[PDB]
Amino acid sequence: MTYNVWNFGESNGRYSALTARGISKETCQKAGYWIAKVDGVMYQVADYRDQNGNIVSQKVRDKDKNFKTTGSHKSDALFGKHLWNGGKKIVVTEGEIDMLTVMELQDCKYPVVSLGHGASAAKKTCAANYEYFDQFEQIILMFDMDEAGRKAVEEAAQVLPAGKVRVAVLPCKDANECHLNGHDREIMEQVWNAGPWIPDGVVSALSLRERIREHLSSEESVGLLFSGCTGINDKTLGARGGEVIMVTSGSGMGKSTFVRQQALQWGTAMGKKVGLAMLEESVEETAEDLIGLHNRVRLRQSDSLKREIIENGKFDQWFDELFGNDTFHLYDSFAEAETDRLLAKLAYMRSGLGCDVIILDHISIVVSASGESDERKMIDNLMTKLKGFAKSTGVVLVVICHLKNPDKGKAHEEGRPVSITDLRGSGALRQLSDTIIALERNQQGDMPNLVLVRILKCRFTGDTGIAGYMEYNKETGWLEPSSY
Amino acid sequence: MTYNVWNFGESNGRYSALTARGISKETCQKAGYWIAKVDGVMYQVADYRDQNGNIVSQKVRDKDKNFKTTGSHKSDALFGKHLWNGGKKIVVTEGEIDMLTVMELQDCKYPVVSLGHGASAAKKTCAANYEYFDQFEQIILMFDMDEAGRKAVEEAAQVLPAGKVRVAVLPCKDANECHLNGHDREIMEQVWNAGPWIPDGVVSALSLRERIREHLSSEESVGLLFSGCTGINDKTLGARGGEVIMVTSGSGMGKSTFVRQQALQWGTAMGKKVGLAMLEESVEETAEDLIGLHNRVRLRQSDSLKREIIENGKFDQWFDELFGNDTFHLYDSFAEAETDRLLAKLAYMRSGLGCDVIILDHISIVVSASGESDERKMIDNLMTKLKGFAKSTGVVLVVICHLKNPDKGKAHEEGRPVSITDLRGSGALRQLSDTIIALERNQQGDMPNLVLVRILKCRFTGDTGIAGYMEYNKETGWLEPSSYSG
Amino acid sequence: MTYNVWNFGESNGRYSALTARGISKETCQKAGYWIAKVDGVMYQVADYRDQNGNIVSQKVRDKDKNFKTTGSHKSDALFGKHLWNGGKKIVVTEGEIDMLTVMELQDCKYPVVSLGHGASAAKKTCAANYEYFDQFEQIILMFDMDEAGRKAVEEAAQVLPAGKVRVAVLPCKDANECHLNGHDREIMEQVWNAGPWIPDGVVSALSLRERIREHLSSEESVGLLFSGCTGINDKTLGARGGEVIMVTSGSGMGKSTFVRQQALQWGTAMGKKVGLAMLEESVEETAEDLIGLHNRVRLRQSDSLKREIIENGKFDQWFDELFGNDTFHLYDSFAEAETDRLLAKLAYMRSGLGCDVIILDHISIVVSASGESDERKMIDNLMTKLKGFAKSTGVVLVVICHLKNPDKGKAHEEGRPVSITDLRGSGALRQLSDTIIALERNQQGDMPNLVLVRILKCRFTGDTGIAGYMEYNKETGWLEPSSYSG
C-alpha cells in the first residue's frame, strides 16, 4: 500500500543545489538529497539508507511542501544515519533541510542526522534509536524554535541517553532560517563556540530580565488600595496584579457589601476596569446596588426611590455619571456556570475587554464533573486554575468564600473570631489566596453595624491581625471607617 | 467504502445557474459548484479542493436534498478554502448555498467559505481549521438563523481565534433566504460590520444600560405580596422575579397549607398566573384544597360538604369563580418525576403558559441518575438548576423542603427553633435560595394552631428574625394573623 | 475455531533455503520449517512437534509477516523442543528466524529452541517449561536487542531456573540481523559464555571501588553549610546531595524567606547552580525577592524603591551583579502543574543545566490524577519519586511543606513546637526525606521577628533538637542570627 523508493536514474534525478535554502550541490550529494521531475512536477527526495547503503525509505516533498513517503519508513528513520559510524558529537535536527544546514557549515565532515517522522514522532524516533545515539558522547537536538518544536525537544530527551542531550539556541525559526539571514555564527556555536544550554520548557533563561523589567515598570505596583477603612492598607498595601484577595465572613455580614464597595470605588475614583461575576443575583440587581451605592443611597430597599428616579428619567443622570466610563463588566446567566465555562468567561474580560480587576462572588457554586464524591476536591481543582489564570495574566482577582458552621460554641453571627480553619473548602484556600480579609460583627449585640476587619494572611507583607473597624451606614449602605 | 470522486467531463457536468437560489453561472464556476446529469440523474456537486486545486472530496445533493459524499471528507472540510490565501476578513457560512450567496453579492472576490459537515461538526471543522482561519484578521460566522444555528454559532466561537470571531444576524432563515426576499442590504452590511461576541452576555449593554433601563423600569412588577400575615413583608418585601423562596417547617405543620394560600391569593385577587407542581398529591387533591380554601371551607374535611355542593350544583359555581380567570396550572406525573423531566416542564409553564410564579411542593423527591452515593448532591444539583432557571426567566420560585430529625432534644413538633444549621448544615439550599421562610408550632402545647413565622434568610433586605404569628382556623383552613408576643 | 494443521504434501510443501535470512535448506529440514504455496503465496510454517514427532501446532507467516496459528498452540509451545532430550546448554531465542540462526553455524548439533508466542508470553512460556528447561546446565536467552526484547529478558530471573539463565548481548537487532551483516562471531561467543544474569546487580560490590572513591572525593557531600544561623550547621553539617531537606512551619509566617536566602547564598557565595520551582509566584516576582534580598532591601514592599532603580538605571546594575553568573534557574507555568510530565522536567534538569541544588517551594500542588479519593497517597507517591530522582542523580533537593492546623490549643502562629506528627500528609515525608528543618515564631507576642529553628530529623548526624535563633530584619528582609536563650 505504501509507495516505493524512487530510483535516482529513473525519475529525471539530479544532484542540484538548494539555492532557496542555502545548500550547495556538494552537500546534497553526500547526504543523499536529489531532485526528481515526475509528471513535470519538482519533488524533493531524502534517501533513508540502511547500514549497507541500500535505500530503505524516502521522504518526498514538492513545491507546495506536501509530504509523500516511499518504502519502509520504520520508526527508527534517521536521515544521514548511514554516514556516521560513531564519534564524539552528533547533531539531530528535525527536518532534512535543517540537517543539510549543519553539514554545510561543517563541510559534511561531522555527524548530523534528522528525524524521520517530523517533530511528532520525535519521542518514538529517538527511543527507537537509543542504541544508535548512544554511540556518541553528545546528542545535539537541533529542532525547530516554536511551540511544537519545543514540545518535540522535551519528548525526545526523555527517552534519550540522559547526560548527553544538547539543544541549539536559534534566533530564527529553524537551522535553515538562521543560515538564510545572517546567523551562521549561532548555529556553529554548538560545535564551535557554545556547548552548554539544553533544558527548556522550564522557561528558565536567567537573562529573562525583560519580563522583570516589564513587571516593575508596567504593573500599577500597588494597583489599588482597599477603600472603606485604612489599616487594611497598612497591613496589605492594597492588592497587586497577580495575587488573589480572599474575602469572607458570616452569612449576611457584609461580604458582598464590602467587595461591592471595592468594585464601585475602583471603577469610579481610580478608573479601573472592574469585572463582576455575581453568580447569585441579576446584573440589573448588581448594578442596582452599584447605582444606589454610588449615590450614597439604599436604592434597593426603597420602592419609593426606585419609583422616584423612574418617573423623570433620573436613571440616565446617575447611570451616565457612573457606568459612563465603560469600566464595569459582569456575568449574566444563573443557568449553571461550569468550571471551564466560567474560567473561559473570566478570561474574556481580562483579555478581550481589558479589565484590571475580576470579582467572583460565592465560590461554593461549583457545577462541574458531578460524580466525584465530596466537592472538597472540586474546590481544590478550581482554586488552582483560578489562581493560575489570575497571575499568568496579571489581573487582580478578588473572590468570596463562605465559612464552615462550627457548631462548637457561639458561632459567627454572635461574635467568634474567624481563623484559617473555619474557611470553607479544603486546605488549598489557606495556600493559594495571597491575602485573606475577614469581617466579624455581632448583629445581636449593642453594635450590630460595627464590623471588625481581620487579616488572616498576606504573602505580600506577612503582617496579620486586626486592621481596623467599620460601621454600616443604614442610610448610604456604605462601610465607613470607625474609630477605636 | 466511500464513493469515487465524480468527474466533471464524465458526468455531463455543466456550470449552470441556480435560478431558484439566486446564484448565476459566473458564481458557480469560481467556487467549483456544478450540475451533473447522466440519464436525467440531477445532482448538485460541491468541489472541496485542497491548496493546489486538486479535488479531494465532494458533497452531492439532488432534488429531494439528499446527501451523498465522495472521496475523503476530512475534518478540515472547507468549501472554497482553495480560493483564499489570507486576507483582511473572511465570511464563514453554514451551507454551500449560503457560501454562494455571499460570493454573489461580493462578485466572488472576497473570502467566503462554507462548512463541510453542516452545523453539527461546526466545532470540529473550525477547530481543525485554526491554523488556516488565523490568516485573517476577522472571521465572519454567518450561520443559519434558528435554534440549531445559534448553537453552532456558540460552539464555533469557543474553538476559533478569539477576538476575530464575528456573527451575522439575518432577518430570515439563512443568507440565501434573505437574498431571495429583498434583503441583500442586510447581508452586505453584515459582511464588514457586526463585530460580535457572542459572549455569555457580559455587557454588551452599552455599557450596562440596555437591560438595566429595561429591567428597572419594568422591575418587580413581580415583587408580589405575602399575605396571611404582615411583618413577613416588613422584613423581606416579598420575593422578586428571579429569587427563590424556601419554605420549611416541622413535618406536617403547615408547609403545604401556608404556600397554598399564597398561590391562591396571588392567583385570584392580583390576577397572577401560578404554576403548581405537587409531586406528593394528585392534581385532583390540590384542586380540592384550593376550591375549599377559596370559599373559606375545609372542603376535604367533610363528606357532607363534598356531597352538598355537587347535588345542588354549587361545585360548578365555585369552580368557575376560581379557575375561571385561567390562572392556575399544574403538572401530572407522580412517576418519580426525573430532574430534567420536571425542569423542562417547569420551564414550559413560565414560557408556554406564561406563569409569573411557580410552586414546587416537597423537594426530596429527586430520583435522577440513580447510582451515585448519597443524594446529598442531588438536592444540591437540583437546587442550582432550580435557582438558575428562576432568574434567566424572571419567575418567582417558591419551593418547600423538609428537615432532618434532630433527636438531640425535643424535636420541632413540640417547639425548638429551627436555625440555619439544623436543616442540612452544609446545605446548598441555604446558599442558592434568597429568602427562607420557616414555621414553628407546638402541636402538643396550649396553642397547637399558633404558628410562628421566622425569616432565616433574605438576600434582598438582609433583615432576619421573627416576623409574626398566625392562627390555623380549623373552619376555613386559613392562616389568619394572630396576636402574640411571648 | 482454531485452524487445522497444514499438511506438508497437501500444500505443495517444500524445504527451501531462506536466502534473504541466511538459512540454507539443510537447516530448515532439521528444524521443521517449510514453505507452503497455493494461490500465488509462499507461507513459512514452523512445525511445533511433541516428543513423538507428531505435529501439535504450527506458526505460519507470509511476505508481510502476518501471523496465523494452526492446531493446539499451548502455553508450553517451544519450536524445536522435540529435537533435544537434555544437554549441557540450550539456546532460547525469541522468534523462529532467530531460532533458525544459531544452530546453522553449529550444523544443527546443539540445543536451540524458540518461544511459542514471541516476547510477550516470555514469562508464561518459560514458566510452563520449567521441567523441560531444567534438563540443561545452562539456558541461553538470546532474545531481541531492543526496548521490548530486553523486557522479555528481564522477566527471566523471575520465572526461570535460578542459576542456569544466560543473557545474550548482540551488536544489532536480533540474532538474524547480526548474521546478515558480519557478526556471526558475536553470536557464537555468547552461546557458551555471558553468565550474568540479570536484574539489579549490586553484587558482589568490589566493582563499585572507583565510583565510591569518586563519589566521596569529588562530592564531599554536595554543597552543605546553611546560612542565617550557626547551629543548624552544627547539628546537620549541611545538606548532602541525594538528601531531601524538609522545611516547614505555620503556613504564613516565613519558611519561604529562609529557603530563599539559602538559594541566594548558595548561588552567590558558594557558586552553585540553584534551580527554583516557585509554584506560588512567577519567576519575575521571585527574582524581585532575590534581587532585593541580595541588595539587603525589601524591593517588594517599597513603591519608592521599585521606581528608584528603574529611573536612575540601578536595576540593571544589581541585576547583572546577581544573575550575571547564570547560577539561578527557575520554573514557570502556574497553570495547574501536574506530575506527568513535570517530575520529568525536574528530572530533565541536573543533567542538562547541571543544577547542584533544586528548590521546591510548596508541596501541596496536587491537581494530577484526580479521581483517587484523599490526596494522602499522592503526597506519599510524590515524595518517593522526588526522593528517588534526587539521590539517583546526586542533586540537593530542598522542599517546603505546610502543617495541619491542629485546633487542639494555641496553633503554630502563637507558639507551639512542631513535632514530626504535625507534618501534613500521611507521614511518608517523615521517612523518605533525610533532614527536617522547622521554624517557630509567635507573631502575636513581644518578639515576633524572633524565630526558633528546630531539627526534627537528620539521617546524616542523628543530632536533633533546637538549633539556634534568628531575627527577621524588616529592613533587609534577612534572617540574621540572634542571641537568645529561653
PDB file of C-alpha atoms in Angstrom, chain A residues 105 182-190 192-193:
ATOM      1  CA  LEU A 105      28.658  24.671   7.860  1.00  0.00           C
ATOM      2  CA  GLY A 182      22.992  36.150   8.847  1.00  0.00           C
ATOM      3  CA  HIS A 183      23.381  33.836  11.810  1.00  0.00           C
ATOM      4  CA  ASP A 184      25.668  31.063  10.767  1.00  0.00           C
ATOM      5  CA  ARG A 185      27.519  32.249  13.884  1.00  0.00           C
ATOM      6  CA  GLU A 186      24.877  30.917  16.290  1.00  0.00           C
ATOM      7  CA  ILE A 187      24.471  27.580  14.510  1.00  0.00           C
ATOM      8  CA  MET A 188      28.204  26.864  14.538  1.00  0.00           C
ATOM      9  CA  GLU A 189      28.428  27.679  18.273  1.00  0.00           C
ATOM     10  CA  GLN A 190      27.283  24.213  19.354  1.00  0.00           C
ATOM     11  CA  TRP A 192      32.438  25.789  17.546  1.00  0.00           C
ATOM     12  CA  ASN A 193      31.723  28.144  20.483  1.00  0.00           C
TER      13      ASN A 193
END
